Amino acid sequence: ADAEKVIEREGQESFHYGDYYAYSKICTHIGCPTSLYEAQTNRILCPCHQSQFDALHYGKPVFGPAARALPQLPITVDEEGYLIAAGNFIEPLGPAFWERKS
Amino acid sequence: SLATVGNNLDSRYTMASGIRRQINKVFPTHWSFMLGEIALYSFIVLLLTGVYLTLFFDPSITKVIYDGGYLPLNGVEMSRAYATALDISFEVRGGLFIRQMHHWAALLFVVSMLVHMLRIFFTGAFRRPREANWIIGVVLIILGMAEGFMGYSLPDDLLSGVGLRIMSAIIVGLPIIGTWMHWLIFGGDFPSDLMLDRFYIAHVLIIPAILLGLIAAHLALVWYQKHTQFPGAGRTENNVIGIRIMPLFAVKAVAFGLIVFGFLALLAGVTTINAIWNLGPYNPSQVSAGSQPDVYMLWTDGAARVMPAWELYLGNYTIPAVFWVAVMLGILVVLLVTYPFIERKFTGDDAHHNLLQRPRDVPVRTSLGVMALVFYILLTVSGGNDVYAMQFHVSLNAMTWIGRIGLIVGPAIAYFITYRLCIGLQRSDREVLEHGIETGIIKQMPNGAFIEVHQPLGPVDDHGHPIPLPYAGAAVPKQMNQLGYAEVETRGGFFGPDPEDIRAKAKEIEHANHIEEANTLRALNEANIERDKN
Amino acid sequence: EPEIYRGVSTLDEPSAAWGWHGLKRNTIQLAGWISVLFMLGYNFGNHKGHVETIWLLVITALLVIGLLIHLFEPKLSQVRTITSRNKPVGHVEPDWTYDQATLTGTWGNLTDSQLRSVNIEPSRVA
Amino acid sequence: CXXXXXXXXXXXXXXXXXXXXX
Amino acid sequence: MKSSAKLMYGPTVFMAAMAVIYIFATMHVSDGGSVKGVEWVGSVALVLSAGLTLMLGVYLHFTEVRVDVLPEDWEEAEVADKAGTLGFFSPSSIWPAAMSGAVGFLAFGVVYFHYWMIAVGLMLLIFTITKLNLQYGVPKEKH
Numbered sequence: 023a024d025a026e027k028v029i030e031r032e033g034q035e036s037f038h039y040g041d042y043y044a045y046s047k048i049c050t051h052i053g054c055p056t057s058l059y060e061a062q063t064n065r066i067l068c069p070c071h072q073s074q075f076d077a078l079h080y081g082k083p084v085f086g087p088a089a090r091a092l093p094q095l096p097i098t099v100d101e102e103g104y105l106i107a108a109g110n111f112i113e114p115l116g117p118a119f120w121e122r123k124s
Numbered sequence: 125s126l127a128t129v130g131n132n133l134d135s136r137y138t139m140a141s142g143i144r145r146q147i148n149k150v151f152p153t154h155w156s157f158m159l160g161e162i163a164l165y166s167f168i169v170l171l172l173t174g175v176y177l178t179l180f181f182d183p184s185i186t187k188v189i190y191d192g193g194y195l196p197l198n199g200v201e202m203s204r205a206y207a208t209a210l211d212i213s214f215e216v217r218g219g220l221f222i223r224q225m226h227h228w229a230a231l232l233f234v235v236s237m238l239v240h241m242l243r244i245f246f247t248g249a250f251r252r253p254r255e256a257n258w259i260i261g262v263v264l265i266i267l268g269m270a271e272g273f274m275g276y277s278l279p280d281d282l283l284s285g286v287g288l289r290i291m292s293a294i295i296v297g298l299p300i301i302g303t304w305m306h307w308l309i310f311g312g313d314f315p316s317d318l319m320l321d322r323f324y325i326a327h328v329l330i331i332p333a334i335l336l337g338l339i340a341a342h343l344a345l346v347w348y349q350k351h352t353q354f355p356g357a358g359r360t361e362n363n364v365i366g367i368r369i370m371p372l373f374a375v376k377a378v379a380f381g382l383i384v385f386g387f388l389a390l391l392a393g394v395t396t397i398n399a400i401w402n403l404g405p406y407n408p409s410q411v412s413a414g415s416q417p418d419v420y421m422l423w424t425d426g427a428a429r430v431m432p433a434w435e436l437y438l439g440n441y442t443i444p445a446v447f448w449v450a451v452m453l454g455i456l457v458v459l460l461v462t463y464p465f466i467e468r469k470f471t472g473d474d475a476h477h478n479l480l481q482r483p484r485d486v487p488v489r490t491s492l493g494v495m496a497l498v499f500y501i502l503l504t505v506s507g508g509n510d511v512y513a514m515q516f517h518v519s520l521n522a523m524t525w526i527g528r529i530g531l532i533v534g535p536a537i538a539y540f541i542t543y544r545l546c547i548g549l550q551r552s553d554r555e556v557l558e559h560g561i562e563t564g565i566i567k568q569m570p571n572g573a574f575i576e577v578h579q580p581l582g583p584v585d586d587h588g589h590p591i592p593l594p595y596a597g598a599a600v601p602k603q604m605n606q607l608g609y610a611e612v613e614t615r616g617g618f619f620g621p622d623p624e625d626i627r628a629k630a631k632e633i634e635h636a637n638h639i640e641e642a643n644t645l646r647a648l649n650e651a652n653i654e655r656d657k658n
Numbered sequence: 659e660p661e662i663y664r665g666v667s668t669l670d671e672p673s674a675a676w677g678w679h680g681l682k683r684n685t686i687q688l689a690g691w692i693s694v695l696f697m698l699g700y701n702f703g704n705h706k707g708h709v710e711t712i713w714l715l716v717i718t719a720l721l722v723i724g725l726l727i728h729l730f731e732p733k734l735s736q737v738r739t740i741t742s743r744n745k746p747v748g749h750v751e752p753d754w755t756y757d758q759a760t761l762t763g764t765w766g767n768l769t770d771s772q773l774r775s776v777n778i779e780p781s782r783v784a
Numbered sequence: 785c786x787x788x789x790x791x792x793x794x795x796x797x798x799x800x801x802x803x804x805x806x
Numbered sequence: 807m808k809s810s811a812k813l814m815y816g817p818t819v820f821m822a823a824m825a826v827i828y829i830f831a832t833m834h835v836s837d838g839g840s841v842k843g844v845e846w847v848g849s850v851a852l853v854l855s856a857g858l859t860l861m862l863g864v865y866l867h868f869t870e871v872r873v874d875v876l877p878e879d880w881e882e883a884e885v886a887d888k889a890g891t892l893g894f895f896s897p898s899s900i901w902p903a904a905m906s907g908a909v910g911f912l913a914f915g916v917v918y919f920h921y922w923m924i925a926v927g928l929m930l931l932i933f934t935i936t937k938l939n940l941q942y943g944v945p946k947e948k949h
């Protein structure tokens with residue numbers, strides 16, 4: 023019911039399997055792991071400085087000091103029926119720095 | 125045997141007049157003139173427990189499979205640093221005791237300086253000529269905080285590792301040269317080899333040496349100005365009234381010295397700190413909810429939490445939101461360091477002050493201090509607002525907003541209240557000088573008027589109504605027990621009544637004693653007056 | 659007589675001569691307005707909720723109201739009225755209890771009947 | 785300042801995976 | 807307080823009579839709008855409610871026997887009769903506010919049910935009560 027009300031980012035509409043979404047675990051504020059995934063509110067909370075990234079909005083932050091959304095990894099299933107990475111991230115991972123932009 | 129050791133030690137160092145000068149230095153006796161000693165004693169405990177702690181510690185990041193005292197975590201792949209820190213608490217006899225002593229001493233050290241700095245600030249001991257001391261001390265506290273930070277990051281556990289991840293990612297996200305500077309410090313991407321080595325070699329040498337040098341310079345410079353003191357009876361701006369170094373000051377210093385040492389030895393045993401066996405080896409993927417650094421580092425983390433997402437995108441380049449945090453912390457440090465200069469610009473008074481001043485008589489500075497304390501406390505609370513939120517049942521979003529808004533309205537309310545209370549304390553101080561001590565004897569006059577008996581501290585004119593004594597910068601008595609009108613006049617033990625014969629003489633002797641004391645004190649006052657009119 | 663030291667009277671702040679006393683009124687408003695700027699600037703984060711903005715605007719309004727009545731310094735005047743059996747400014751109050759104890763002033767002229775009603779015989783007064 | 789290069793979805797999507805190999 | 811010790815007998819005897827009526831009327835009357843049997847809350851707390859008034863009444867009665875005719879208790883008393891000392895009233899103290907703060911700390915301790923907070927609040931309260939009592943006793947500072 024939740025997968026059907028996801029808003030995709032431009033250029034990554036094909037980065038999900040059936041119901042599976044893979045986001046980088048490293049916070050886009052500072053390199054803390056954002057692993058506090060709330061099952062019902064569908065928000066991912068960072069323990070360090072309390073950024074909430076939406077899971078139904080391609081990882082867009084909705085609270086805290088984080089300004090950039092969480093990078094998403096393409097995934098798919100191979101012939102043997104194991105989950106594999108279909109490609110690579112389309113942006114640098116983790117915290118921002120001076121030279122990081124296009 | 126003793127006459128001859130001194131004889132052949134003086135015959136070659138000509139030290140009779142040099143030593144006599146040191147042992148005759150007078151030091152003001154006040155409980156707030158000792159808070160600096162606490163920092164010193166805690167520092168001695170740190171460097172002594174620290175040396176013992178380095179005989180068992182290997183600061184290497186090289187991964188090993190653990191087999192040791194801790195039966196859990198056997199078979200777990202950890203760094204060499206973590207394995208040895210885990211060995212000095214489960215395989216070294218009394219090693220946990222010393223480890224905990226070290227950490228407790230670190231905490232006390234930082235709190236021994238903060239409280240000391242507050243004493244210096246409030247009483248105005250940073251004024252001319254004592255600004256080198258203020259600058260030296262400020263550098264001392266910043267370096268103490270930095271030292272503590274790199275100390276608990278040595279074990280390379282999961283909790284401390286996240287602190288290093290935060291610190292590295294703060295550096296890397298600096299405009300222009302934050303990328304090169306990060307790579308110059310860590311020697312590459314985080315984590316790196318020679319990252320626990322540079323930190324270990326700067327925590328047990330670089331910082332200690334710098335700190336020891338600054339401390340020694342600090343103390344020597346203090347011994348040169350021979351302290352400061354509060355206004356009081358017989359004490360002017362060109363003298364020190366207190367006790368000599370021997371036999372009174374030196375013994376009191378040792379007594380208090382070992383008291384602090386003994387207190388740290390109690391907490392080291394009875395109270396757990398930094399239970400690293402429950403935290404596990406550092407792993408970049410694993411994190412915990414309570415990832416606060418340490419109490420003295422909470423303010424920096426609290427600053428990072430309450431800063432909104434304010435990134436500046438400049439085409440091919442980006443300024444992170446955390447940059448503003450750095451800017452803000454930089455401003456706070458600059459404001460703190462260069463305080464004597466800003467205080468004397470807006471007061472226009474630089475007149476070689478040797479007499480202290482009570483906080484109540486400087487409402488602007490006192491209020492600024494309490495304003496800044498509330499700022500620091502709110503940053504500190506915001507730094508651990510996730511443990512506040514759960515344990516005290518408050519919304520975490522609400523806590524963030526309290527921090528954000530509270531940093532503006534908290535300081536404002538603190539200033540207002542503190543200013544008013546300072547003036548209130550000033551007013552209460554004048555009522556006593558004008559009218560006398562308010563005794564609790566509500567007499568009824570024949571007409572029926574209820575009147576309170578007032579005890580004048582000065583001469584009266586015709587019919588009570590004391591001649592108002594001018595303010596003197598000292599503490600005025602407020603109760604009648606402060607003049608010894610409640611003093612117990614029954615010598616003896618708890619059960620022993622004590623013979624009257626020996627009980628009469630002792631009360632007479634003490635009476636003559638305090639009479640002579642008061643006489644000598646008022647004579648000193650008179651001397652100052654007729655000295656100040658020439 | 660009260661003394662002024664640095665624009666601050668010893669009458670208002672007793673120990674005006676001992677320490678830093680009184681911030682100039684222009685510095686109390688600089689801080690206030692800078693704070694208002696920060697409080698208005700808080701509305702430019704990523705937060706989706708609107709409860710926090712209600713608090714921001716309310717607090718900003720309270721700050722603005724404060725900084726205006728600190729600036730224009732509103733004053734009023736004495737009411738200058740007369741209420742039932744209340745005397746105007748410049749009336750001297752007789753010591754009623756003194757007049758009661760010794761038969762003077764207000765109690766200066768009592769009828770012999772009125773003396774006995776308060777338990778004192780007129781033969782005792784001359 | 786508001787957002788670097790992250791933009792919303794182009795058009796709403798739906799599919800059936802049905803990844804089969806018998 | 808000559809009449810004060812006496813007027814407490816009124817409520818005392820009233821409540822004593824109501825408590826005995828209550829017990830006997832509640833355990834022996836079946837109304838149909840309730841059940842039969844002694845009520846153990848209105849009985850104990852009304853017997854012991856009369857106890858309070860009796861205690862205060864008796865204490866004031868014993869006290870008023872061994873007091874002389876005071877000017878405040880004399881119908882035709884001059885103002886100059888009490889001319890003297892009315893004993894010792896505390897002019898000021900900070901400790902009431904402190905000990906209210908201490909009870910507040912213990913209060914929140916019990917609310918959150920934090921053992922450390924309860925313990926600290928308990929000993930933060932002992933300290934302030936102690937300082938309240940020892941306020942006028944603090945000896946002149948011995949050097």
Ligand SMILES: CCCCCCCCCCCCCCCC(=O)O[C@H](COC(=O)CCCCCCC[C@@H](C)CCCCCCCCC)COP(=O)(O)O[C@H]1[C@H](O)[C@H](O)[C@@H](O)[C@@H](O)[C@@H]1O
Pocket residue numbers: 519520521522523525526529530533534537707708709710711713
């Ligand atoms: C030592 C003295 C210290 C005393 C300090 C006491 C002051 C603390 C005040 C605390 C107020 C808290 C009210 C709670 C408000 C709250 O929970 O709202 C939150 C956002 O918090 C806010 O903005 C409020 C922050 C503004 C507070 C300003 C505090 C400044 C203080 C320091 C100064 C004033 C007091 C000074 C006293 C000092 C004494 C001397 C005079 C957002 O709600 P949210 O977590 O998103 O959850 C919901 C979903 O669950 C749900 O779906 C729903 O649908 C959603 O809508 C959402 O609400």
Ligand code: HEM
Pocket residue numbers: 156157158159160161163164236237238240241244249250254257258259260261262264265339342343346349350351352353
């Ligand atoms: C490393 C921690 C520190 C130690 C061990 C230390 C030690 C001392 C000692 C032993 C004194 C002698 C007088 C006294 O006890 O009050 C003193 C005085 C002084 N300290 Fe510190 N101090 C430290 C930190 C600081 C800090 C952080 C500051 C300032 C920001 C500072 C500024 C002063 C000043 C101005 C004096 C002079 C007080 C006076 O002469 O009246 N100190 N210090």
Ligand code: HEM
Pocket residue numbers: 167170171174175177178181209212223224226227229230233268271272273275276277278279327328329331332335397398
């Ligand atoms: C200057 C003041 C100092 C402070 C504030 C300080 C602070 C700390 C702290 C907070 C820790 C973490 C301890 C723990 O895990 O429980 C630590 C660890 C350590 N410190 Fe220090 N320290 C200081 C000085 C020194 C000195 C002078 C040495 C060596 C000569 C030293 C050697 C060590 C060692 C070996 C560790 C080992 C890490 C461990 O076993 O936990 N320290 N320090």
Ligand SMILES: CCCCCCCCCCCCCC(=O)O[C@H](COC(=O)CCCCCCCCCCC)COP(=O)(O)O
Pocket residue numbers: 241242245459460463466470492493496497531532680681682683685686688689692693696
């Ligand atoms: C342990 C703490 C001890 C150190 C205490 C800190 C004191 C350093 C601060 C110096 C303050 C100078 C005060 C002064 O001289 O007053 C005035 C300085 O000018 C100002 O008021 C600056 C305005 C800045 C307001 C900042 C707003 C904050 C917004 C919230 C940010 C989120 C001058 O005083 P005067 O003109 O003489 O009345």
Ligand SMILES: CCCCCCCCCCCCCC(=O)O[C@H](COC(=O)CCCCCCCCCCC)COP(=O)(O)O
Pocket residue numbers: 419422504505508509511512515919920921922923926
């Ligand atoms: C000075 C600034 C300090 C920075 C702190 C930042 C603010 C966040 C504080 C979080 C508080 C968590 C409280 C809590 O959860 O309670 C407990 C967890 O932490 C503690 O135990 C608090 C210990 C604090 C020291 C008290 C010692 C008492 C002995 C006194 C003898 C002298 C849980 O309750 P419990 O222990 O089970 O009773």
Ligand SMILES: CCCCCCCCCCCCC
Pocket residue numbers: 127130131134139140143
């Ligand atoms: C009677 C002559 C021998 C004793 C003279 C005193 C010896 C010198 C003492 C110097 C003390 C320096 C510590």
Ligand code: FES
Pocket residue numbers: 049050051052053054056068069070071072073086087088
């Ligand atoms: S590191 Fe994830 S929010 Fe600060």
